């Protein structure tokens, strides 16, 4: 089994750059290399084949070149659409091989999220349990903290997050952090906040409501 | 075009059998070579193996040959792989492609066409269809559905049939601490639509055969 | 004002890859580039003067091209000592401009973390307040979840992470989490004990201790 | 070997001014051009300016000139940073450094770190982790402002196994942070365990003996 490496195993760069990926192989293979693109959520993509080929239908940013055993894969023009997964597998010998991919992040302006709180509903309340739902809507960077008060008294360990893939059309991320509470631990409270921290923001943002 | 629709995933106990089958349109499939290859998830890509146009030729990578084979029914347009001795590290979306960029005296290809996958879950665990609750709205407001307490995953979470795609955001679901998954689906809509506008989600766990369709109201 | 674009931002590579890094001067500076390594919670450091030329001292593995807008850093094979922020600065005219920097992480094998829990010291609790801290040393991926568990039920309240860059010789991570009681409150519970999943360890490993033991 | 010192960093209010000295040693500081640069936390470098050996070459960063005055002491071996009606975008990591080849930095102080906030200076609380093959064992340094606090062991002796993790911002809005050292355990009672602790914006140092 030909051993095929990737490198960088990840990165992030601005729309309008040019990036360069490689792929090494632990043994010659001549031309018989392909470049896949695997978008967030979808299956993979052909690119190019034989080292330097587009596969009909692909932009003529994107670019393959090399032999034997050190390939290259560039995109000369970075756009938004072009966070993915890329990944060179070799057509030489069997089994096939794949990389282990280059995760392609955009870098971009900061932009703070827009805060939304969501009580349990009267439905889940029936069951006897109680979810508290905060949604941290289009943000860059990716780090952001979700604090949660309960009666502004900070809590731990009772909740838990979910951020979405970077979006293709604006480079942004959401999340959502649910704290879940026994209904008898949630009927004993009245204020439950979510307080956010992020670059975007000067001050932390604190969505609340009334139980 | 060529169209290639994966089908039989889902929750399989450790040590248990699957069959996967593909069916296509778009061409004819008797005079291709097909091929299946997988993904753990948030892991990379594995080559399963191949099945030329006449079976005549069946490749796998060694280390999977045992427990997987490969057929093809030519009349069906139907591709197939069987799955036995299922381990935990079998879990993955299995895809079939359809091979092709020969031209080449030699045995090589690119993929130029995959199905969308299909996702083969192994657990002892048992099935559970999920809760579906309504995150009520308070310019922009934003509106979702809890799709809480399902195993295996996936669940499929569309709005008002498929009519609202823009600012929706279906969140990657989490293990909570019971075994049981459980999601969020959101869109954020002018604050002047709530009151005239209906938003309906509808949830969709093919492993329990459930399908809900919930009205979110502020 | 000559702007200074480098690219990627970022970067995660393995031990022994070559790693190239680009910086795009707005106007040409002729060879008047040079780069500069800052490791975590060090100063700026000389590498790379004039375009190619290596400065005393500096590691063969180190290399530099380009001229006039365009110009590539290049780390022939990574070594672990590399993890830091790679910054280049134009010396052509005044005033003198740097590159915004490439970050440069290491991607490794996974590293279980050992588990240490400390119980608020005797000088601490005179003073009104119990901190109970829960150290993972030496981990990898930087992905953990720790959890509180006070009498064996889980503990809702005042806990804080930090953790620390990759090390420079191991290229793993080091995290403390910390909770914060009062007096009182510390004194409400006998069993304090913090809980641990990482990606390395199997099941969860929990470290604890009994107040006044 | 060439060595540069800051010092003269802390807490500074919106509007304030502060100087900032670079004590320089190995090296004949008056045949020398000398620079500042900064960096904001978290952030790239930024290039302040720079002052010939007899002071008729002084040349700043357009945007900074009102803000920065350089001057230097030849007979004293320092470099000044006269910092005039700081704002909160001026809080950073203060560098001097030396160019040479003729245009780069060769050497580089380890920088001081000027905040520029309406709070007040806090000296911090500092407890003793102690633990009970490798055993942990650290010092918790609680409740300061502004930053920085620096960390040692047994005065330097002890840099192996060493992580002095970076601050966090309480609900209270002082920092609190954690130094812990990982020691074979066979040694607890054998050695003695002291960090030293100190925070010059408030001119606190404090030995704390670590025991099981
Ligand atoms: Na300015």
Known sequence: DIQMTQSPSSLSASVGDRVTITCRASQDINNYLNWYQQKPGKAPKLLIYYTSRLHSGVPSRFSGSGSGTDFTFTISSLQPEDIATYYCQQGSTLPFTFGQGTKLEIKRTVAAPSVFIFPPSDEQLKSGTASVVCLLNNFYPREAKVQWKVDNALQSGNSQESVTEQDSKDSTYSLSSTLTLSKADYEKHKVYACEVTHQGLSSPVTKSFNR | ?218
């Not at chain 2, 778009?26 to 993904?39: A, I, L, P, T």
Request: include cysteine.
């Open chain 2, 1 to 218: 075009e060529v169209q290639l629709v994966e089908s039989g995933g889902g929750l399989v106990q450790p040590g248990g059998s699957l069959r996967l089958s593909c069916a296509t349109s778009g061409f004819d499939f008797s005079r291709y070579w097909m091929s299946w290859v997988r993904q753990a998830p948030g892991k990379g890509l594995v080559w399963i193996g191949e099945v030329n146009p006449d079976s005549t030729s069946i490749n796998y990578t060694p280390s999977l040959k045992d427990q997987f084979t490969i057929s093809r029914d030519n009349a069906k347009n139907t591709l197939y792989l069987q799955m036995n001795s299922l381990r935990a590290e079998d879990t993955a979306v299995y895809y079939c492609t359809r091979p092709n960029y020969y031209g080449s005296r030699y045995h090589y290809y690119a993929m130029d066409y995959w199905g969308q996958g299909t996702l083969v879950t192994v657990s002892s665990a048992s099935t559970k269809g999920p809760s579906v609750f309504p995150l009520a709205p308070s310019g922009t407001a934003a509106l979702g559905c809890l799709v809480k307490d399902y195993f295996p995953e996936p669940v499929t979470v569309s709005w008002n049939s498929g009519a609202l795609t823009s600012g929706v955001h279906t969140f990657p679901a989490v293990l909570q601490s019971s075994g049981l998954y459980s999601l969020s689906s959101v869109v954020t809509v002018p604050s002047s639509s709530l009151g005239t506008q209906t938003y309906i989600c509808n949830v969709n766990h093919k492993p329990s055969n459930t399908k809900v369709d919930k009205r979110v109201e502020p």
